[PDB]
């Protein structure tokens, strides 16, 4: 009635599972009572006590046994009777899964040993006293991640006699970046502090010029968050033998972010409308989606980069992977490996905007994850690219990663994961080209500094900004970056255009244009300026072409264009200034307010094109959080959540959000309706449990407007 | 209240089924004149007919599809015929070819071809050859870097006020494949006899059995049957890929191997072993790739079942049809599932016996997979060629998936850091056997090693025949080797894994000698299983050998010990002694699973010295063949009867015998059953066949039942010109 020829032991790919072991293997009475028995097991598991200190532990929301991979901790057993080292034989078991092996690593039998070796799982008796062992039980820093069972076997000379089931001694396993033979081994502790024991984050999002920053909950630590990144694991059927390894882990893992079908955490969009969930901009941090996506078991609506980007932080971060979110700004998605991003000109200089159907993100965010990399050269371990945002790779629409930041900045994008996708997000030229009405192309310009501008991430210990643009390229016009390009270019990296004619403007005409920062609802200017650093005169026509963008760069409109006919004398400067009036824009804004400039000129002597892009972002007032009462954990305290609508229009199905880990557990309310320039209150009665600098932080979202934050720095105290 | 797509501007083109409307003219901004005064098209020949030069120098002609066929890098000749003469003065025209809904020029979905004086290699273009009446003759070459596919073809006629362009017409429609012919194409093979096998041959030979008894049996490809080439654009179709990157090689072979072995209701064969197979067709069944791809276009879903011959089949006609050269390869004593782990463990008891609830990992008999002929320009100089791609899927560094490509250079050498999955195709051919004493206290102690067992062989059919081709030198050094061993370092250092040390197994105190035969048996007859101890040293011992025989899948998966021996040998100084075990039919008869595979351990433990000797080895029973008969003229067109005979081997009742014919270009895949079949009883198929391919061709059978099954035979056949 059917044969398992496949293979002979089913897959033992869920943690959630388990077998039962036998309290009793005996091999026949041939032909008890005096061998010894368990009573009771001890393992210091109080938060405050040792071994949760000592491994890091101690801010999880859980009341089992939690501790670090290759890092000693202490238990005792008790016995019916004292135990004697002449006669007795026991050990102690750790079990995961269905269908545990020994040599799979999922069946673990702890040797009692007089000396602990480096390395290698041992129970080390450091005390006898009456019926009692305390020992000191090392794991290998190699240790598979996950929830263990634990029993101990009392070895007869006719069989095992083993401590029947007990979820009270159930052991988490996690990673170590404290230990020297982990593989993510982080040797500094202030990295530790932030990477892995941080669960407040700063997401930068905006444009280059106008940095903006809202606060993101990682939560790792809350209630029910550390089963549910078991889950996840589960969820995508991943084999236990691979928890241990961070690559794997990595990998799996971030391909579970991204929802395809009713598999993956999160189902991505942007509509702008987000009808049967939750608009992106309207999440505060992971906890909230996580819990979601354990209880409903299915993709939770809506997400976005920089969401995929908190959640899957989380994950890493709860499991002990040292991780840190980065934004890049200009960001070439979706590059396919090319080096090049087209812009189609109209032969009298305007952009072509039906030819031109690429676009640059005002920013994009990734991970990324600290890890040894034993699967290639010497050199390549640190912080390693891992991008949840699908794009083309060579394996189809995935996330892309774990890619070594060491490849990245040296060329070196022969070694694995998807690594020339990521050279390209950061490295692109612009490439200007004018499609001419009988069909022939022609190359007019190449931008090479206006993709991957800067990258940046939180500081340690702050929530400033902290460039790491140089981690991921060598500075422009240095001998290593030309180099590292060249790499590249021969380990798959393309370059579709050949542009040598190109970039030697005989002009010496300079060109550039800035915009003023705004305000929602407000005016502003745009200057542009104009170098003549030749002895000759001449005569040029500009073309301004303004859009209302997504934060992707994917325009929706065209709301102001505009022509210059500028004459510029030999050794001269001219400014000329447009003025932007807000009912221009309004009414047609997108979320996030970004707008798009294109200034490009034509140099009617000369025949040379000169372009320049820039993007804006209005700025939109914050959300006012005011606290009322004494601060001190266990005991109330009031906060209140003030949004004042700046648009004078009525804003409708206002949803507003709170959420801080370790004072409240994520809360929303909704507003019917807000009248145009009025102010609406939130009142919530909080009772933190965690003391130190906490924060607490809010979003607002609406029918029409949305991605508007505030966030506030509270100080609690113990008892 | 809006609707706006913000991830991208243009959704992605990844389906060639779909279609874009071009408009038939397309004019921009104000006028005022007539239009009649510019080029018409009346008629488009592409000269496309089997026997004309197109398809035949572009090694097309043997596909049946009746549409142009040409193969990118490479020429070809059209013919417009216009309304009145074209004037190079004053006329300007292009042709133009299109794929998907969304085609972009720089995506390389939308290309213009422009009229040029010259040909420029590697690039697009079209040069006129010849100018008569109305008319005009083109020669066309394509980008060796062209996207593989269905393009349809229009022909644009600029004005000053835009474009005036031919309308839809779906008999231009023109398929662009990989060309093996093309130096500048990624699968440029230089040689046409590898060209012919590896891309044209439409049957092939794949070897299964066990290393001391290699068993053959014919698959037809069929790459160039009605259908095929259509079924294998809608795999990719399937899957989503990219219209954008199936040109490269690579990605094509990355995402079509993945689409295989069917994940819930995405893919093409649904993998099952167990023996059973209720409500599908049994993976022995199957002849040949066509069946299952034409089942799987028009059901649209996966087909049940398959194993791993059966995916190699199926992906090697799959990149055949497209152009890219492919060959299935065997490796005998394969070690699957190992997750990058250099060593497979055998567990044994105190006294020497095999622990057989400890051992649970299995050596396969053999293992088939595929190579792809191609350069790797992701990759270091040097790392082209063949490269591993095996789409029978176990754990790699993303889950449970096929692996590959893996240049088979880089395995060779140990570079395993290289794309894609290389440890784990590396460890499939060179794992150590590990045998490990369970003591009863708990503790593990490693008693011997073996590191000649696993990828003992690796075969591919041969060039123009259906010999085998030892390829084992390709994925190997000699062993004992210097580049063996620092093949092996360099594995260890990216990646690859040995768990236990073997530096004590230093154990090597073989001053004594063991080794055992199995005869080759038929099915039903009792055999011999020879064991020969050799004392190489003045010493005099006694030993205790034990005998394990089971019954197991192709895989080595065991599912019952039909016998079970011991033996106390004494052996004097520098003699050899010999004991022979007869295995009656009796023993195994009515509990063996398909494949007729039988595995032995032959364990023995040296009372003196306390050494371990270890060996295994399998069997597999031969069963008799399929007999082909043909009576005819044998000439394409006219008809040929094919008589197939098969004679039940069993003294029990065949129940529910299906038996299947096959052989491309004389005959689509076909099945008969057959209520039971009495014991020792001989049935008859008899068909009428009108083949339509001339030369060496060959006819496929194979039988499978309720109890019995993987039993083939096959007939070379010559039909003939007229």
Redesign the interface.
Known sequence: ?????????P?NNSNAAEDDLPTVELQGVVPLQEFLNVTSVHLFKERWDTNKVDHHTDKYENNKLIVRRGQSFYVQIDFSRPYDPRRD?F?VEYVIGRYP?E?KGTYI?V?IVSELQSGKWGAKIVMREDRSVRLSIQSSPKCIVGKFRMYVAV?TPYGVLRTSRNPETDTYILFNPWCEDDAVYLDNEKEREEYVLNDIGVIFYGEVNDIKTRSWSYGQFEDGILDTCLYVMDR????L??RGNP??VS??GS?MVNAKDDEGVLV?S????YAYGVPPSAWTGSVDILLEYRSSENPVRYGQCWVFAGVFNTFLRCLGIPARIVTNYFSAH?N?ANLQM?IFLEEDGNVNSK?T???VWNYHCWNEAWMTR????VGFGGWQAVDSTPQ?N????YRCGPASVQAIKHGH?????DA?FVFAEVNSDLIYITAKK??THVVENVDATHIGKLIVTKQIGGDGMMDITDTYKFQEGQEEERLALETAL???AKK?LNTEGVMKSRSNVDMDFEVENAVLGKDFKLSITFRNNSHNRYTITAYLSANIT???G???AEFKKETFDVTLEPLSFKKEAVLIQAGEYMGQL?EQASLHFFVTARINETRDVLAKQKSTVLTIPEIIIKVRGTQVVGSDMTVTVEFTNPLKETLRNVWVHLDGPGVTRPMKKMFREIRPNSTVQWEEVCRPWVSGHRKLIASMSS?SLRHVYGELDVQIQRR
């Open positions: 009635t059917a044969f398992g020829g496949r293979r002979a032991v897959p034989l050990r092996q040599n039998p040797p070895w995508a059927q991943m084999d033998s691979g690559i794997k990998r799996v391909a991505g942007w509509d702008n409308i979706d396919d087209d030819l159907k690429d676009s034993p699967d290639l050269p083309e060579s394996d189809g629409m994008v022969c070694f694995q994961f020339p009988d069909g021969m380990y798959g579709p997504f934060y992707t994917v325009p929706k997108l029918d």
